[PDB]
Design an enzyme around this catalytic site. Structure first.
Site, PDB file in Angstrom:
ATOM      1  N   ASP A   9       1.638  -2.857 -37.192  1.00 48.31           N
ATOM      2  CA  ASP A   9       1.069  -1.522 -37.184  1.00 48.31           C
ATOM      3  C   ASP A   9       2.088  -0.585 -37.798  1.00 48.31           C
ATOM      4  OD1 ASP A   9      -1.187  -2.407 -35.842  1.00 48.31           O
ATOM      5  OD2 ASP A   9      -0.297  -2.000 -33.883  1.00 48.31           O
ATOM      6  N   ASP A  69       5.679  -2.806 -34.568  1.00 48.79           N
ATOM      7  CA  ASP A  69       5.250  -1.417 -34.678  1.00 48.79           C
ATOM      8  C   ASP A  69       6.291  -0.630 -35.467  1.00 48.79           C
ATOM      9  OD1 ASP A  69       2.958  -1.727 -32.701  1.00 48.79           O
ATOM     10  OD2 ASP A  69       4.624  -2.284 -31.462  1.00 48.79           O
ATOM     11  N   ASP A 108       3.934  -8.042 -31.316  1.00 54.30           N
ATOM     12  CA  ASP A 108       3.661  -7.639 -32.693  1.00 54.30           C
ATOM     13  C   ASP A 108       4.821  -6.763 -33.171  1.00 54.30           C
ATOM     14  OD1 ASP A 108       3.374  -5.118 -31.562  1.00 54.30           O
ATOM     15  OD2 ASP A 108       1.256  -4.909 -32.047  1.00 54.30           O
ATOM     16  N   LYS A 162      -6.666  -7.413  -1.033  1.00 58.37           N
ATOM     17  CA  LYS A 162      -6.590  -8.561  -1.924  1.00 58.37           C
ATOM     18  C   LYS A 162      -5.217  -9.207  -1.866  1.00 58.37           C
ATOM     19  CE  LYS A 162     -10.254  -7.130  -5.114  1.00 58.37           C
ATOM     20  NZ  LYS A 162     -10.671  -5.943  -4.306  1.00 58.37           N
ATOM     21  N   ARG A 190      12.320  -0.985 -27.082  1.00 51.77           N
ATOM     22  CA  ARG A 190      12.673  -1.102 -25.680  1.00 51.77           C
ATOM     23  C   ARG A 190      13.598  -2.278 -25.402  1.00 51.77           C
ATOM     24  NH1 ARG A 190       6.998  -0.776 -25.237  1.00 51.77           N
ATOM     25  NH2 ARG A 190       7.015  -2.623 -23.887  1.00 51.77           N
ATOM     26  N   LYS A 248       0.815  -1.209   0.000  1.00 50.52           N
ATOM     27  CA  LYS A 248       0.000   0.000   0.000  1.00 50.52           C
ATOM     28  C   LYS A 248       0.853   1.267   0.000  1.00 50.52           C
ATOM     29  CE  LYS A 248      -3.936   2.268   2.094  1.00 50.52           C
ATOM     30  NZ  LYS A 248      -3.341   3.604   1.719  1.00 50.52           N
ATOM     31  N   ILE A 278     -13.142  -7.775 -31.455  1.00 46.20           N
ATOM     32  CA  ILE A 278     -14.272  -7.999 -30.565  1.00 46.20           C
ATOM     33  C   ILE A 278     -13.921  -7.336 -29.239  1.00 46.20           C
ATOM     34  CG2 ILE A 278     -15.776  -9.665 -29.410  1.00 46.20           C
ATOM     35  CD1 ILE A 278     -15.165 -11.677 -31.540  1.00 46.20           C
TER      36      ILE A 278
HETATM   37  N1  LIG Z   1      -3.198   2.120 -24.854  1.00 50.18           N
HETATM   38  C1  LIG Z   1      -2.106   2.299 -25.591  1.00 50.18           C
HETATM   39  C2  LIG Z   1      -1.611   1.273 -26.406  1.00 50.18           C
HETATM   40  C3  LIG Z   1      -0.424   1.513 -27.131  1.00 50.18           C
HETATM   41  N2  LIG Z   1       0.226   2.775 -27.054  1.00 50.18           N
HETATM   42  C4  LIG Z   1       1.507   2.991 -27.776  1.00 50.18           C
HETATM   43  C5  LIG Z   1       2.569   2.509 -26.754  1.00 50.18           C
HETATM   44  C6  LIG Z   1       2.987   1.102 -27.254  1.00 50.18           C
HETATM   45  O1  LIG Z   1       4.358   0.725 -26.825  1.00 50.18           O
HETATM   46  C7  LIG Z   1       2.827   1.313 -28.789  1.00 50.18           C
HETATM   47  C8  LIG Z   1       2.426   0.078 -29.578  1.00 50.18           C
HETATM   48  O2  LIG Z   1       1.381  -0.665 -28.896  1.00 50.18           O
HETATM   49  P1  LIG Z   1       1.557  -2.249 -28.756  1.00 50.18           P
HETATM   50  O3  LIG Z   1       2.165  -2.921 -29.981  1.00 50.18           O
HETATM   51  O4  LIG Z   1       0.096  -2.735 -28.407  1.00 50.18           O
HETATM   52  N3  LIG Z   1       2.347  -2.406 -27.253  1.00 50.18           N
HETATM   53  P2  LIG Z   1       4.064  -2.788 -27.292  1.00 50.18           P
HETATM   54  O5  LIG Z   1       4.745  -2.670 -28.584  1.00 50.18           O
HETATM   55  O6  LIG Z   1       4.698  -1.898 -26.140  1.00 50.18           O
HETATM   56  O7  LIG Z   1       4.259  -4.226 -26.651  1.00 50.18           O
HETATM   57  P3  LIG Z   1       3.876  -5.613 -27.380  1.00 50.18           P
HETATM   58  O8  LIG Z   1       2.724  -6.272 -26.774  1.00 50.18           O
HETATM   59  O9  LIG Z   1       3.486  -5.236 -28.874  1.00 50.18           O
HETATM   60  O10 LIG Z   1       5.047  -6.561 -27.370  1.00 50.18           O
HETATM   61  O11 LIG Z   1       1.653   2.190 -28.922  1.00 50.18           O
HETATM   62  C9  LIG Z   1      -0.290   3.749 -26.270  1.00 50.18           C
HETATM   63  O12 LIG Z   1       0.249   4.855 -26.156  1.00 50.18           O
HETATM   64  N4  LIG Z   1      -1.471   3.515 -25.518  1.00 50.18           N
HETATM   65 MG   LIG Z   2       3.963  -3.763 -30.247  1.00 49.66          MG
HETATM   66 MG   LIG Z   3       1.132  -2.772 -32.047  1.00 55.91          MG
HETATM   67 NA    NA Z   4     -10.603  -8.001 -28.639  1.00 55.90          NA
HETATM   68 NA    NA Z   5      -0.454   3.591  -2.082  1.00 51.45          NA
END
Ligand SMILES: Nc1ccn([C@H]2C[C@H](O)[C@@H](COP(=O)(O)NP(=O)(O)OP(=O)(O)O)O2)c(=O)n1
Ligand SMILES: [Mg+2]
Ligand SMILES: [Mg+2]
Ligand code: NA
Ligand code: NA
Length: 326
Positions: A247, A183, A181, A63, A174, A51, A97
């Site tokens: 993407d 990007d 995926d 929890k 990173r 906390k 979905i």
């Molecule tokens: N809600 C979100 C989703 C994505 N993004 C931006 C930050 C993410 O690093 C980038 C690409 O989204 P992403 O492909 O779904 N996530 P990310 O590449 O970090 O990790 P992975 O799950 O693809 O390995 O878009 C954002 O700013 N807000």
């Molecule tokens: Mg990604």
């Molecule tokens: Mg993506």
């Molecule tokens: Na979905």
């Molecule tokens: Na806290």
DNA sequence: CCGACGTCGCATCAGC
DNA sequence: GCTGATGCGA
DNA sequence: GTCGG
């Protein structure tokens, strides 16, 4: 991985609130708390100890005490036995979905993978591709495959116009050893904040990548954002690679640093950084950082010459991409 | 206590 | 067709 | 669900 049991539980509660309760801010609450605990460098002994972390309040502390004493969470154990929640939680795993369409499908008695496959004509286009590659989209991408994919995208983009720059962002930038995926941030000198001197700049790239059968399907496509599917080529007698989500984001060339900061993420890192920006009197999107007036209206875009300029404005010490995995 | 929770692109639909 | 809201996602 | 005014 010190507190893996706790962070899993929180993520599953977050997913429940997003998909079933449709309470996005509880989803964000649980996710923030899961994130802050994930980077805590001690094996947590109590809800009280947790906390003290920002984002962990009374309810999540309780929890954690339950989870630590028993290894389970009665609240989740019930959610798991509820049929509507289980159905909704499954259907939302198909790309396209969301919580609303998932609950609608259940209402119509479409609630299993076999139901979806008998009712393709009730799916929009995005959902039908999400069903097609349901299994493939669950698989992670080894960084070695990400490097092969990078090689193709960058060389095919060069062939279209040597003045394109394609940068792979997301978890790959990173330094992740595996990615969900791919990007790709795209720039070209003809598209700036001031003018668009050439049409079809994104389209030409998408088309080339389809021509070489790298891009295989299209989930959505506009002038600046493409969401689709791609696949590495396989050799003779080799099993094919899984199909992957890709993407592509075309961003004005003069706004590259705001764009690459955004596309590098993580998503929670972006939420936390943009929230902090607000607390400092700025708003950040993928294009600009701007002051807030006392009025509450954004001002003019501030000069940005590196990602670090953006950190400086909000009085954050710079953080390299590998340290943004919140 | 209680308002407020990052920011935006594309698909789809309702209303005119 | 245009506009604005909602869903879904990055 | 949490937290700052
Ligand atoms: N809600 C979100 C989703 C994505 N993004 C931006 C930050 C993410 O690093 C980038 C690409 O989204 P992403 O492909 O779904 N996530 P990310 O590449 O970090 O990790 P992975 O799950 O693809 O390995 O878009 C954002 O700013 N807000
Ligand atoms: Mg990604
Ligand atoms: Mg993506
Ligand atoms: Na979905
Ligand atoms: Na806290």
């Amino acid at each position: 991985t010190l507190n893996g049991g706790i962070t899993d539980m929180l993520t599953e509660l977050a997913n429940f609130e997003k998909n079933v309760s449709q309470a996005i801010h509880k989803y964000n609450a649980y996710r923030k708390a899961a994130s802050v605990i994930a980077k805590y460098p001690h094996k947590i002994k109590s809800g009280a100890e947790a906390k003290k972390l920002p984002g962990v309040g009374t309810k999540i502390a309780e929890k954690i005490d339950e989870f630590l004493a028993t290894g389970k969470l009665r609240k989740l154990e019930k959610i798991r036995q509820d049929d509507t929640s289980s159905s909704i939680n499954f259907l939302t795993r198909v790309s396209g979905i969301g919580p609303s369409a998932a609950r609608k499908f259940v209402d119509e008695g479409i609630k299993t993978l076999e139901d979806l496959r008998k009712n393709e004509d009730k799916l929009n286009h995005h959902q039908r591709i999400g069903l097609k590659y349901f299994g493939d989209f669950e698989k992670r991408i080894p960084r070695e495959e990400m490097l092969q994919m990078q090689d193709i995208v960058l060389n095919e983009v060069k062939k279209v116009d040597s003045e394109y720059i394609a940068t792979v962002c997301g978890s790959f930038r990173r330094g992740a050893e595996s990615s969900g995926d791919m990007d790709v941030l795209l720039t070209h000198p003809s598209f700036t904040s001031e003018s668009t001197k050439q049409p079809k700049l994104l389209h030409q790239v998408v088309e080339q990548l389809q021509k070489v059968h790298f891009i295989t399907d299209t989930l959505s496509k506009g002038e600046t954002k493409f969401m689709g599917v791609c696949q590495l080529p396989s050799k003779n007698d080799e099993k094919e690679y899984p199909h992957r989500r890709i993407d592509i984001r075309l961003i004005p060339k003069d706004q590259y640093y705001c764009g690459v900061l955004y596309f590098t993420g993580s998503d929670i890192f972006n939420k936390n950084m943009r929230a902090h920006a607000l607390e400092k009197g700025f708003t950040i999107n993928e294009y600009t950082i701007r002051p807030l007036g006392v009025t509450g209206v954004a001002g003019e875009p501030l000069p940005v010459d590196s990602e670090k300029d953006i950190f400086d404005y909000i009085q954050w010490k710079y953080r390299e991409p590998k340290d943004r995995s919140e």
